[PDB]
Amino acid sequence: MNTVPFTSAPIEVTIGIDQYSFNVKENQPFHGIKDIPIGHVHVIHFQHADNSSMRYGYWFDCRMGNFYIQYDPKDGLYKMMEERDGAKFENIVHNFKERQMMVSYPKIDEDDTWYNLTEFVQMDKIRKIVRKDENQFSYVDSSMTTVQENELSDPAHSLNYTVINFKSREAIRPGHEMEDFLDKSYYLNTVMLQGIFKNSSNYFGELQFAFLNAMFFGNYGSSLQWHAMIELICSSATVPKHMLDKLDEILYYQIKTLPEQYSDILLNERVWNICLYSSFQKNSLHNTEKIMENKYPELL
Amino acid sequence: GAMNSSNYAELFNNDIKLFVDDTNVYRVTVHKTFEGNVATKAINGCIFTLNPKTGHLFLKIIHTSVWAGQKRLSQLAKWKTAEEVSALVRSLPKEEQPKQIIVTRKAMLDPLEVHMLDFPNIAIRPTELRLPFSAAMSIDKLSDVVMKATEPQMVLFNIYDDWLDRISSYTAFSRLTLLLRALKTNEESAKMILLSDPTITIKSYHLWPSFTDEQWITIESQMRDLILTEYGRKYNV
């Protein structure tokens, strides 16, 4: 079990850790989050009491270093940092625990939600999508745009998701125009799985990461990316059976976890009605279909 | 964006553009089978691809053999249209390739767009206009060449005959669309109006009669009266 200490909490802020969140008051004696489960990525995120705009946060994995939060009054945000002095860092973490100024990562033992949402998400891949190689953790916020968005302006701050475009030469083999557009199997399996992602796990990892950024930060281009990767699979007639079953599970936990109030902006009506009811894979998402009908029958 | 009443004069600037109409690509007769079930029989069709500024028509004949052994033919028809249009563009010298292609039915956008990915700088546009190009098979010479064909065949026409010698493209397109609108709403009457007078003939290299200017005015008024009459009848107004 690992710890992310906070130097202090100078401004009133809602702090999230994965799917949990706490309200912290201006200059409340808050000094970090403990008992964070080793073995998964995590995201710590923030929304200032004064600016319900720009949710922001940091993806990290505690196996990759000792990380802490420190408010910067110049840039006006809670920053993640790395402490390279392992001894100095154990000393801070122990003193804060002794004084019990830390909240406990509040996991229910029965609960596999966070595992289910992050199963294929791997910190090394996140750091290729969020390129900032001097840090072992990755910053994401509400306003960051994706590479594809930039094409249709600052590249240093971009989400370098894999570009998916159903009306592109990449997607459409010459002479198979109609076939490939109506049946994306060759784009999914040869171009994307075998070519770019190399395996289904990396593909599912990007898909889950895009979902989590749309959910946690209302990052619009991540939501586009999540829907695109879903649609590519659902619009392929030939999909490995193991990928369909896993997809059903992935989507089920994403739909399960989404805040009910956000179903309007976070769920693309066209994509979901097409995936669940028109696509080759209509009949292959039984759990996802069942949870969608019982929780968001309006959208459908 | 879409083409509508507002940007109507853009058809007649010097940016090369083509209308594509697919309504006559996949044509069938519906009949009963011996067992009393319904069946279709395809007949030859055509893609109506027209430069509205110059009159040049690129009439790609679609022979029934295209359909042999294929499923979902109405969907395939859209993709075949897009394939043929794309090949037409590739066949044209660079300086004759259109800058825009305007499809008369929105369902052609994705098929053409996909077929034209090699031409990213050719813009594929829908239209809000309710153009009467389906009535092209009401023009006797176009219908005859389609129905006589024994193989895929491209036949080139000028759909304005020699009218541009005397009127502008804008006026020529307005005449063409009035004639076709009339043929669409009441073919028999439309055709009666055009041929009533046997002393006004169609040149072997033309589609329409050699009306004088004054006779075109009488014709156009007759066509307008036809269209209004049929409107009152349709809607009881």
Side-chain angles (χ1 to χ4, degrees), chain A residues 1-151 154-300, chain B residues 1-235:
Chain A
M1 310 306 274
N2 267 127
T3 303
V4 174
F6 283 48
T7 293
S8 64
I11 66 155
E12 197 173 307
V13 54
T14 302
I15 298 174
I17 172 70
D18 299 350
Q19 71 273 33
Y20 313 108
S21 69
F22 316 108
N23 307 306
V24 168
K25 293 298 167 298
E26 169 196 296
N27 284 316
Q28 176 184 317
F30 174 100
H31 288 279
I33 304 161
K34 65 175 183 171
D35 303 328
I36 298 165
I38 303 166
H40 314 129
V41 303
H42 295 289
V43 59
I44 284 173
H45 42 108
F46 303 91
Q47 175 176 214
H48 300 173
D50 69 4
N51 192 231
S52 92
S53 291
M54 202 67 68
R55 284 174 268 168
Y56 62 100
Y58 307 88
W59 291 92
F60 64 105
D61 176 350
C62 289
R63 296 169 291 187
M64 287 165 62
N66 300 313
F67 305 118
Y68 68 104
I69 298 301
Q70 188 167 97
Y71 182 70
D72 173 8
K74 178 149 153 95
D75 292 349
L77 80 183
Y78 287 98
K79 300 194 159 167
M80 178 164 286
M81 304 194 282
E82 177 163 12
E83 178 54 65
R84 78 163 278 119
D85 183 350
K88 182 181 190 187
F89 180 94
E90 291 168 29
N91 174 253
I92 290 313
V93 169
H94 173 280
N95 172 78
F96 284 153
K97 286 196 188 183
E98 256 300 79
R99 307 237 278 158
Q100 297 206 42
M101 309 267 117
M102 301 197 181
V103 292
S104 177
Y105 183 96
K107 191 182 170 293
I108 305 315
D109 305 329
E110 175 197 36
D111 181 54
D112 271 345
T113 294
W114 188 248
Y115 177 79
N116 294 338
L117 293 165
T118 56
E119 175 160 8
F120 304 94
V121 180
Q122 306 281 357
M123 195 66 227
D124 76 284
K125 299 302 196 311
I126 285 181
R127 301 187 69 245
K128 300 174 194 314
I129 299 165
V130 197
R131 303 180 176 278
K132 192 163 198 249
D133 290 348
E134 61 275 9
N135 297 338
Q136 292 274 281
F137 51 85
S138 301
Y139 174 94
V140 182
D141 71 20
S142 286
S143 73
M144 280 167 57
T145 53
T146 69
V147 156
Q148 176 172 69
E149 289 187 300
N150 295 345
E151 301 171 340
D154 190 28
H157 223 55
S158 296
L159 294 169
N160 302 268
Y161 294 121
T162 301
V163 178
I164 309 185
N165 178 3
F166 299 138
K167 294 196 269 175
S168 74
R169 175 53 61 211
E170 291 77 21
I172 302 285
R173 277 171 311 175
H176 306 242
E177 278 77 15
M178 173 186 191
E179 173 195 15
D180 277 355
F181 184 73
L182 292 180
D183 174 10
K184 310 197 180 296
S185 287
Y186 182 90
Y187 192 33
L188 168 66
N189 291 299
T190 296
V191 171
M192 287 273 167
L193 292 177
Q194 164 187 337
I196 297 185
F197 288 102
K198 304 305 182 189
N199 59 53
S200 46
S201 292
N202 297 333
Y203 184 104
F204 289 144
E206 182 160 324
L207 189 159
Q208 293 183 310
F209 181 55
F211 172 72
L212 284 171
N213 292 320
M215 184 174 54
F216 284 132
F217 310 112
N219 189 273
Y220 173 77
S222 302
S223 183
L224 285 171
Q225 179 67 13
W226 173 58
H227 283 88
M229 304 188 70
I230 292 175
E231 187 168 357
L232 178 53
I233 289 173
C234 292
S235 303
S236 293
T238 301
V239 176
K241 311 89 175 51
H242 77 271
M243 277 188 60
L244 295 165
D245 299 323
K246 187 62 75 156
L247 180 54
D248 199 31
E249 292 300 309
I250 288 177
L251 295 176
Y252 170 85
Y253 285 102
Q254 288 170 343
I255 301 317
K256 179 179 192 67
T257 308
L258 266 193
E260 301 68 18
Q261 300 303 320
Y262 291 50
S263 53
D264 46 309
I265 39 177
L266 282 179
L267 292 170
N268 189 281
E269 171 178 90
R270 170 196 71 92
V271 174
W272 282 99
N273 281 278
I274 270 66
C275 292
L276 296 177
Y277 302 118
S278 309
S279 81
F280 291 108
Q281 306 303 353
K282 60 197 183 305
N283 290 328
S284 314
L285 302 177
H286 296 126
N287 299 344
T288 294
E289 188 176 294
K290 186 167 292 306
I291 199 183
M292 276 285 285
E293 302 188 356
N294 276 277
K295 193 176 179 198
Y296 306 124
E298 331 86 48
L299 184 89
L300 322 165
Chain B
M3 223 258 293
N4 51 36
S5 283
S6 318
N7 55 32
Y8 177 80
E10 186 184 12
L11 297 172
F12 315 109
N13 71 11
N14 303 101
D15 283 1
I16 300 170
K17 49 180 66 61
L18 300 168
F19 273 116
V20 170
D21 179 90
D22 69 316
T23 56
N24 287 306
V25 168
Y26 172 50
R27 301 206 285 169
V28 294
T29 55
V30 187
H31 61 88
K32 284 274 201 63
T33 73
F34 180 90
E35 296 76 18
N37 312 126
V38 177
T40 57
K41 178 184 166 301
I43 59 167
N44 288 344
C46 57
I47 307 167
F48 176 95
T49 299
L50 165 66
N51 180 330
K53 174 78 171 158
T54 70
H56 285 207
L57 170 64
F58 300 86
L59 191 77
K60 179 52 191 238
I61 300 182
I62 301 306
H63 186 259
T64 57
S65 70
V66 164
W67 310 133
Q70 319 292 319
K71 277 104 184 67
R72 297 179 59 65
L73 296 183
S74 79
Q75 161 191 273
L76 173 64
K78 293 169 194 333
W79 289 90
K80 175 78 175 163
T81 296
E83 188 177 353
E84 289 302 345
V85 164
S86 167
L88 172 57
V89 176
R90 287 164 217 284
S91 82
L92 285 164
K94 189 186 190 201
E95 61 272 16
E96 297 176 42
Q97 293 182 341
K99 291 133 223 169
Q100 296 170 33
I101 306 178
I102 309 162
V103 301
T104 61
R105 311 200 288 176
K106 310 189 176 69
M108 283 297 310
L109 292 167
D110 282 340
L112 199 52
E113 200 158 323
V114 169
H115 270 286
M116 301 286 292
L117 286 170
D118 290 334
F119 299 95
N121 298 357
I122 298 176
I124 308 312
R125 303 180 71 197
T127 178
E128 295 170 4
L129 308 176
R130 40 266 200 178
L131 292 161
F133 294 147
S134 65
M137 292 300 93
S138 287
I139 304 174
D140 296 314
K141 293 199 182 176
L142 300 187
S143 177
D144 284 347
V145 70
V146 170
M147 289 315 288
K148 295 187 225 292
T150 68
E151 40 181 349
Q153 173 177 0
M154 160 84 90
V155 182
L156 303 189
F157 294 83
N158 191 316
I159 203 163
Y160 298 149
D161 293 346
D162 63 348
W163 303 341
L164 292 173
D165 285 355
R166 316 187 53 80
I167 69 183
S168 59
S169 303
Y170 178 108
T171 302
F173 190 77
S174 305
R175 185 180 285 163
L176 171 67
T177 57
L178 168 66
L179 292 162
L180 292 175
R181 175 69 62 204
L183 289 157
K184 190 162 181 165
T185 61
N186 188 332
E187 187 184 43
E188 195 206 278
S189 283
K191 287 191 166 175
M192 286 177 59
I193 289 159
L194 288 168
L195 330 170
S196 73
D197 188 340
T199 75
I200 318 174
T201 66
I202 304 172
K203 290 290 152 291
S204 61
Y205 47 87
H206 283 177
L207 302 181
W208 315 98
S210 303
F211 292 118
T212 68
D213 287 5
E214 302 302 80
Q215 290 170 356
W216 268 125
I217 298 298
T218 308
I219 293 299
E220 288 155 339
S221 169
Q222 284 172 26
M223 295 300 189
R224 294 190 191 89
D225 289 326
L226 182 164
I227 294 154
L228 311 169
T229 290
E230 288 298 332
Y231 187 93
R233 182 195 201 284
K234 314 312 172 73
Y235 297 83

